[PDB]
């Protein structure tokens, strides 16, 4: 057998909290216990249903917003939170007064909420190599979540991605488990507070580390695919983030969509109980992913004893929660789910709600952390995100030191991504895919063109925006902003590594500018390295900017001099994913036996280098 380390070494239980739990459990019926374990979503839940059942939690799925209103005032969010809170404190119909909690996914800030600060996606945060930065982003994120009356946020994502074909590659900090391990505990403590006197106090939120486990190791990077690896590899490559997150006392863990050697993780008792709970020693609660239970053998949308028996404590059933609730009760009464199992699930979940202060705090709109609407999209947070943007950029090529550009130059800005905030933000940004977003969906955000314009104008230079690369006066330099369209999950799964393999539209723009003898600085937006030898050859400089988020001016901060013509910020980012030399290097990872990357893990030029990148082979595999 494979031995996993015990990693819950810091958080000690609170005896007063445990006494309350035991007292509560002793008086609860089977029905009240099961209610705590079921999680409806606001697109399908009514206040009357909450009064009737007293569900343990409910989900902000991000597709609906409170009362159906696409955008909504703080008072509207807090009114909804109060209505649900009072419905659950009403023991009239279900016979008990256990306060519910609201949960939300926080992909890069409070990212499904209109007006929220959008931080760079994880891959670029990985490039930054800055653990203190990560902790501060967690702190900012807790405040923005608190400002909407939500107690529980899903973050960090600790996937370690080994095949970049996966549509969720950008949600991972690195292909390297050591980097993810360094980061995970910082995000957990940033959100929840450090283990100690401030643990879960004030604006601190309950956190969820996702996803357990191996979703970044599926064959061919298929989303929700099959992870083929022995147990030691599962432990040493894919679980490193959980070691530090559990050690820092993360309150919740979310189970994963993928399979491990042919078995769905959500139904695997060995993973979710024996490994996660018994060996690693996780003392918090396991939450399932969105209708993930339906894919477990023998389960469906309205029933899944297997997942509950495997070690899932809270079931995310956004739509079918009512039928799922009644079915689960009948299964406990039939004896096919042990009362001891239900008791343990409720213990672990109440241990989180009670210790966070659910009985001690007032109703949502009256809590101290609800009195600060400015926290949502706060200037201080946008300043933090802008710093993250600067540190996330990786300079791949800078021939003849064309960067940094004098701010007083005449600059042309071109490419589809030049003034498109939806491209710089990527998926999980107000909407799911990000495709339908326009610039007005991001108030107070700044596009890359806008950031450049601001600084060039201040320096007395001239700037022009033209996506197609048209100009009146021939510029000194063209900054071309190009990249992937936004995507989330399986919509982003690819089979070919070549950028825009079907159209090569951006390449034609680059070549057009080169043929006119205009120097070219490419700013590449993507959720992953891609095979871009051709585009690199058509560029004098080439910057991997990943998916920088709302603060586009961080790009100008690095690429441009100040008004005096001096460097203001140098590049500091280093690759956290290996960059492919050939279009078929699908699994190119640090420490591989045959490791032949174009640019290795840890690579990143700075203005102190005087290195040229020569013309590269443009041959593609058959
Ligand atoms: Ca890799
Ligand atoms: K099934
Ligand atoms: Na109740």
CA proximity to 149, closest of 79, 214, 230, 56: 79
* 540 has catalytic annotation: no
304 Cα–ligand 2 center, Å:
9
65 Cα–ligand 1 center, Å:
37
Per annotation, catalytic residue among 289, 467, 535, 557: 289
86 is in an annotated binding site: no
Residue ranges near ligand 3 (ion) with Cβ within 5 Å:
54, 94
Q: Give the C-alpha distances (Å, rounded to integers) separating 207 from 250, 270, 435.
A: 6, 24, 28
State the ligand closest to the CA atom of 176: 1
Q: Do domains 14-377 and 378-606 have the same CATH topology?
A: no
State the ligand closest to the CA atom of 578: 1
398 is in an annotated binding site: no
CA proximity to 417, closest of 545, 278, 600: 545
Experimental method of this PDB entry: X-ray
* 467 has catalytic annotation: no
295 Cα–ligand 2 center, Å:
4
**Which sign does the torsion angle of CA 559, 563, 566, 569 carry?**
negative
279 Cα–ligand 2 center, Å:
28
Residue ranges near ligand 2 (ion) with Cβ within 5 Å:
299
Q: Give the C-alpha distances (Å, rounded to integers) separating 563 from 19, 185, 204, 478, 567.
A: 64, 40, 41, 19, 10
User: Taking the domains of the chain in order of start, what are their residue ranges?
Assistant: 14-377, 378-606
Measured CA to CA, the distance from residue 542 to residue 529 in angstroms comes to 13
533 is in an annotated binding site: no
State the ligand closest to the CA atom of 303: 2
Q: Which residues contact 505 (CB under 8 A, 6 or more apart)?
A: none
Residue 174: phi and psi, rounded to 5, are -170, 160
In DSSP notation, 373-436 reads: GGGTT-HHHHHHHHHHHHHH-EEEEEGGG-PSBPTTSEEEEESTTTT-HHHHH-SSBSBSS-TT
562 alpha carbon, distance to own chain's centre: 33
CA atoms within 13 A on the CB side of 302: 5
Work out the end-to-end distance of the chain between its first and last CA atoms, rounded to an integer number of angstroms.
44
> Would you say domain 14-377 falls under CATH 3.90.320.10?
no
CA proximity to 7, closest of 348, 283, 351, 314: 283
Measured CA to CA, the distance from residue 433 to residue 411 in angstroms comes to 32
CA atoms within 13 A on the CB side of 530: 29
Q: Give the C-alpha distances (Å, rounded to integers) separating 596 from 70, 179, 332.
A: 48, 21, 56
State the ligand closest to the CA atom of 164: 1
- Return the CATH number of 378-606, one of 3.40.50.980, 3.30.43.10, 3.40.50.1700, 1.20.140.10: 3.40.50.1700
Q: What is the DSSP letter of 104?
A: E
| Tokens of residue 585, six digits | 């290097």
48 Cα–ligand 3 center, Å:
11
């Amino acid at each position: 057998q494979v031995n996993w380390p015990y990693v819950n070494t810091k958080l000690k239980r609170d005896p007063a909290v445990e006494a309350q739990i035991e007292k509560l459990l002793a008086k609860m019926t089977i029905e009240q216990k099961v209610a705590q374990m079921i999680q409806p979503e606001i697109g399908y839940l009514t206040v009357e249903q909450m009064r009737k059942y007293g569900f343990g939690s409910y989900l902000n799925g991000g597709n609906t917003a409170p009362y159906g209103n696409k955008r909504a005032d703080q008072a509207t969010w807090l009114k909804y939170a109060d209505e649900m809170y009072l419905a659950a404190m009403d023991s009239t119909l279900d016979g008990i007064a256990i306060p519910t909690v609201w949960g939300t996914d926080a992909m890069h800030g409070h990212s499904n909420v209109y007006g929220a600060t959008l931080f760079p996606h994880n891959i670029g945060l990985g490039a930054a190599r800055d653990t203190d930065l990560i902790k501060r982003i967690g702190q900012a994120t807790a405040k923005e979540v608190a400002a909407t009356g939500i107690e529980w946020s899903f973050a960090p994502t600790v996937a370690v991605v080994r095949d970049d074909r996966w549509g969720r590659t950008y949600e991972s900090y690195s292909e390297d488990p050591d980097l993810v391990k360094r980061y995970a505990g910082e995000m957990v403590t940033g959100i929840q507070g450090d283990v100690g006197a401030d643990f879960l106090k004030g604006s601190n939120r309950i956190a969820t580390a996702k996803h357990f486990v191996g979703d970044g190791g599926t064959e061919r990077g298929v989303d929700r695919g099959n992870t083929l690896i022995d147990e030691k590899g599962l432990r040493d490559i894919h679980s490193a983030g959980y070691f530090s997150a559990i050690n820092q006392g993360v309150q919740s863990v979310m189970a994963s969509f993928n399979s491990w050697n042919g078995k769905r993780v959500h139904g695997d008792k060995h993973l979710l109980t024996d490994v996660l709970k018994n060996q690693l020693g996780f003392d918090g609660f396991v939450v399932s992913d969105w209708n993930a239970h339906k894919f477990v053998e023998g389960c469906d949308l309205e029933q899944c004893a297997q997942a509950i028996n495997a070690g899932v404590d809270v079931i995310m059933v956004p739509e079918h929660f009512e039928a799922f609730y009644h079915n689960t009760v009948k299964q406990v009464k039939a004896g096919v789910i042990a009362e001891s199992r239900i008791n343990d699930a409720v213990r672990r979940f109440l241990r989180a709600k009670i210790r966070w202060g659910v009985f001690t705090k007032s109703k949502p709109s009256a809590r101290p952390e609800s009195q600060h609407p400015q926290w949502l999209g706060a200037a201080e947070h946008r300043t933090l995100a802008r710093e993250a943007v600067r540190k996330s950029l990786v300079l791949l090529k800078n021939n003849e030191s064309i960067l940094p550009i004098k701010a007083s130059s005449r600059i042309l800005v071109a490419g589809k991504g030049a003034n498109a905030i939806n491209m710089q933000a990527g998926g999980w940004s107000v909407s799911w895919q990000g495709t339908d977003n326009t610039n007005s969906d991001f108030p107070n955000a700044t596009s890359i063109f806008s950031g450049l314009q601001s600084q060039v104008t201040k320096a007395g230079g001239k700037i022009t925006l033209s996506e197609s690369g048209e100009y009146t006066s021939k510029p000194d330099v063209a900054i071309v902003v190009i990249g992937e369209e936004p995507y989330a999950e399986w919509f982003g799964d690819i089979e070919l590594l070549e950028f825009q393999h079907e159209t090569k539209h951006a390449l034609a723009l680059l070549k057009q500018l080169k043929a006119d003898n205009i120097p070219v600085v490419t700013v590449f937006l993507s959720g992953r390295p891609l095979w871009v030898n051709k585009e690199l050859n058509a560029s004098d400089a080439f910057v991997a900017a990943w998916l920088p988020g709302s603060e586009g001016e961080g790009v100008a901060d690095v690429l441009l001099t100040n008004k005096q013509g001096k460097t203001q910020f140098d590049f500091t980012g280093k690759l956290s994913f290996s960059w492919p030399k050939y279009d078929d290097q699908f699994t190119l990872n640090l420490n591989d036996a045959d490791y032949d990357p174009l640019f290795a893990y840890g690579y990143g030029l700075t203005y102190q280098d005087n290195i040229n990148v020569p013309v590269l082979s443009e041959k593609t595999s058959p």
